[model samples]
Target chain A: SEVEIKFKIKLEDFLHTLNTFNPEFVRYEEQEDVYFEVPRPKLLRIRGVHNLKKYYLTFKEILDENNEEFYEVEFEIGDFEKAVEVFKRLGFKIQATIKKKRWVYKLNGVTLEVNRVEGIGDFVDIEVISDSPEEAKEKIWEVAKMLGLKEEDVEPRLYLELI
Target chain B: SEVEIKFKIKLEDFLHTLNTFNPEFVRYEEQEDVYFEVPRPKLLRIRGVHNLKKYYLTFKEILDENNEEFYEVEFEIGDFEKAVEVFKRLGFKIQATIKKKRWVYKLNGVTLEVNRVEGIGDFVDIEVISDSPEEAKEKIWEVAKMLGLKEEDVEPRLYLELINEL
Candidate 1:
């Protein structure tokens, strides 16, 4: 289970405020995600992490209309190209390919993702993992407020839908 | 591509006969395979290897009428139970589950498999990898003859089909 909120943000302003709080910076990730054409609210994609040289297969079912809660299944896999080939053989059409450079960080029991996505503007994702979606959203909002993010900055549209 | 020949054999007789020829013995494998419900000549299964504590997802398309040639895709997966659950979620019904104790051997550019299958009797499989099905079949026969296997001992039907009959 996953709980998250996404907000459109000014990259430099948020980065400055985030650094002032001394958040623990995680490693940078260059991800190339291949999303397959599936019905809405269900997602299937393979993520190629360029920095780690690893690949992951992910399936997600959006649990809420707002896209704040998700039921996701993901695991590491071998060979990115082979996986793509197999999906093509299974008759899955390519929906969209998302390329993002992400800066990950952690603060106050939540994970922060600053992403620069191709063909889309920059966004900040604040996420938490918990059984109670309400509690997780509360914790995420706590961090959002610390960075001066308001409800007006919320972007409920998923990247797949936006692209 | 895979080409293979299978034979029904008496376990003790085949073991003694194979030992005499000085075949290089590979490791033993205790395999529990779960086959899914699919159409004829197409196979989808997950194999759990007890000895190695590994799981493999395999898809096979039988290429020939005699059940001797195949186009196969196989890869190692993280978990057996999780994979099974995922497939079931995808609406794949479980067709049959087969357990076997296998002694693997190698000789003369071919792999020999001596299997003691549960609910079935003993069998031997001589397999070769080659693009030319004719050449692969010929090489398999050469090894089969040395092991005292004849055409009469051939079992053309797959174990899955056999279980269905039983």
Candidate 2:
């Protein structure tokens, strides 16, 4: 439905940068992200129906260094929550839960979401929707320049594993 | 309603720099900004207005550049087309018609207006609205940085004389 890029920015600078844009509003919401893995890069079960849809819920597994096309983006979420519950009932020890207060803004066609966790100072999640992926990629860099971001800032990990 | 600054950019680079903002639209409309002025830094008259709270025509004249609040903005008139004609009919004649394809976007509380004239190539206009005049100046510098503008890029001339000088 959408595409995303994550750029890590420091707290004071990140807040100052957001202020520079003069956002219409800064929305604040907290999220509890809990990840549960059965084995290393393996399976866990959910109490929900598993049918063949184009996309269930997958995550982009980090490559050492990556590219946007075939080299990136992986996610699968049938019921990550349910999977964790089921595995926990099976005497499996679940990992840590990430709690965060997210500050978000609507920038152009993209949603600019900044998340702050205890470990990670802050992060910006830039996303857009489009049929032309190239056009989408173009817009990504456009906002990057607007935000004064560099390619190296786009680290390769979902906040869960990353934090 | 808006205070401003003008910066000259190359035709190719101005258009290219704008694409970086992901503007809502790349508005394409030609505007002929006609300015009627006399003397070195004084103005003529609208002739159509005097005792009018509706809107009087006015322009900014810098009393002292070093003084923070020494400039004033004045305006007048009713119908856009009819007003311009009324002034010219009074023998004001025509000063300069800045025929330009203006690309406008709203960034933050300010309007980022870039113009591409037939011969002028590219010009970026940064303007904003505020209660305190000094605050406007402060924010203008803030936006200048965000737009990747340098101090030298800001040209101190109206587009009318600017093109002629060019």
Candidate 3:
């Protein structure tokens, strides 16, 4: 199980706040994700990272309305187009494509992610993985508070739905 | 496109006939194929060759009544169970499982296959790949005549249907 929250942020303001904490910087990634059309509460997508030269197939079973918690299974596949072709033959159509550039950071054992989504506004994800949702949510909100995030800034819908 | 014919044969007699031709022998393979239930004219299966430590996903678009002609596309997959799980999640049910030991032979550019199906029986497949079905069939028949195969020995139905009959 994975738990996280998406917060719509002003890129500059978020970066300024992030730098004050001297967070450990991780590499930047250029990602192109092709999401397939599946029924609600179930999400399927193939993600390709341009720099990594790798592809992955991900299946998610959403557990909540805010899209904050889900059961995810991901495995590396050989070819991006070949995997897409197989899914296409099985009657799944493309829902949307998400293109984003991400900057990853680590602060106080939590992952702080900043993303610039193409055609969409900037956002930050404060994520923590834990078995108990309450504990994870508490940890996220503590970091969220330190970063000055408010309740209204939380975006519940997924990128697929947003598109 | 591929063309082939399956003939029911006595294992001893077939071996004797094959040995007379001085055919080149290929390695023996222990194969377990799990076929999925799909509509007619389309066949899907995942095949695992035990001796080679390889697995494959094969899709065939059948073109003839005897299952002799088809368009086949096959590719190697990483794990057999993982592939099977993915297909099962997609709502395809297993139709049948075919377990067999196969001996492969090559004779004059044609493939001579002998399969000993578990609980079923022995069979031979004379196969050739050609764009022209007529040419391929003629070649297969010529080889078939050499092996003393008669029309009555030919079995048109697939192994799946044959198992279902019992």
Candidate 4:
């Protein structure tokens, strides 16, 4: 089992947030994400945008309050927005889709991240993982405060919500 | 795309109803409706039902007006019930599920149906479909009338909604 804790941050504070922990590893990528019309979970599924040529069409649970994590593979399958269109002709509808760029950092068991969303702005995702939910929640906040993030920044809504 | 119309009926009169259509094709099977709980913010919702013997999971929609159909799949590899949990644990909820045995008959663009609902008794489902939506509906109503079905027999409410009320 795993647990994740997240946080939100302003775009300009990227470096300041990074220096707070001054941890060991970091990487960033310019990713273009195109979510296709789906309220859908493989009525048909597809995805593509190569830096990672392998395409994946994944369906996640609708809420964020349980199980800690979900299963995958039915996960990633098809590709191209056209594949999305095909599913539509078959009678599926699009829900919500988004695109963004990201910078990732791995520290302890945390995926300390910063993202610049298209049409939106930059945000942070301070995720923690551990055998128990409480343990992860306990540590994520410690890291958040270290990064100068207050409790206010903690749930400041979702990163996408910020966007 | 699928265009459908529905009605209510009696079990004893099933054969009599079937005789009226003189349909082009027919098949009957025991079926069930399992609903996966999700969100409507995206404007689209997903429904999956993959269990045993014959696994079928699908997704359907409700729009301003039109198609009455869904996207479905059958995979030999998973247990639909267990899969339901996989979804539940992942934060998705199970609004509920339904079980039943039914009869199916297909005529040109229309599916004449009879269902024996467990706690709810018997009902009919007349599904008409084609590329031309309005035309498909026209044919279904014609079949309903030929079956001597009265407007009072139609069930405009979805079975899921009805079951949830219980």
Off by over 4 Å in 3: A7-32, A47-53, A99-118, A121-131, A139-153, B10-16, B19-29, B103-109
- Sorted into a CAPRI-style docking class, model 1 comes out as acceptable
RMSD of each: 2.2, 26.4, 4.0, 10.1
Per DockQ, the best of the predicted structures is 1
What's the CA error at residue B97 for candidate 1, in Å? 2.5
Candidate 2, what DockQ? 0.00
Give the Cα lDDT of each candidate.
0.87, 0.56, 0.85, 0.56
For model 4, residues A33-77, the per-residue Cα lDDT tens digits are 434343322222344545554444444432235223322434332
True contacts kept of each: 0.04, 0.00, 0.00, 0.00
Candidate 3, residue B103: Cα displacement in angstroms equals 4.3
For all predicted structures, in order, the TM-scores are: 0.90, 0.39, 0.75, 0.48
For residue B92, give model 1's deviation from the true position in Å. Answer: 2.5
Q: Residue A27 lDDT in model 1?
A: 85
| Top candidate, metric TM-score | 1
Per-residue lDDT of model 1, residues B10-119, tens digit only: 89998899989979988899999999887766888889999998887777889988999998877666678876775665567999999999999998789999999999
DockQ of 1: 0.37
Over A1-163, each residue of candidate 3 has an lDDT whose tens digit, in order, gives 8889999998999999989989999978888999998877888888888887777777787888779998776666666776677666656899999999889998987898899999988999888877788899988999999999999999898888787
Q: Candidate 2 — which residues are off by over 4 angstroms?
A: A1-163, B26-28, B39-85, B164-166
